[PDB]
Design a protein that fits this description.
part of a larger assembly, 2 chains, 49 residues, mainly alpha, virus, bacteriophage JBD30
């Protein structure tokens, strides 16, 4: 025959999870602990926490 | 007639909740309270808790 069938099917999504390339680790300063931890528990926190 | 109709219908699931036969009550030791209660509130807990 002359005609040919082209690819178009469903084109499944390519989820295939990849590893994260951009990232970072940090230490939480007192600013967040002040606003996310209640005073009663915060005051008992030692300086080395 | 000669042939007879057999039971098969839908066979509904028998959920019909039953009472629990095996069970127990216990007192939580300090091990779990240490890991589930923050130090600030834990330190204020009396010995009789």
């Amino acid at each position: 025959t002359g005609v040919a069938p082209p690819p178009p099917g469903w084109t499944p999504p390519d989820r295939t999870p990849r590893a994260i390339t951009v990232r970072r680790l940090i230490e939480a300063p007192y600013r967040e602990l002040a606003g996310v931890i209640d005073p009663a528990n915060l005051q008992l926190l030692d300086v080395s926490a």
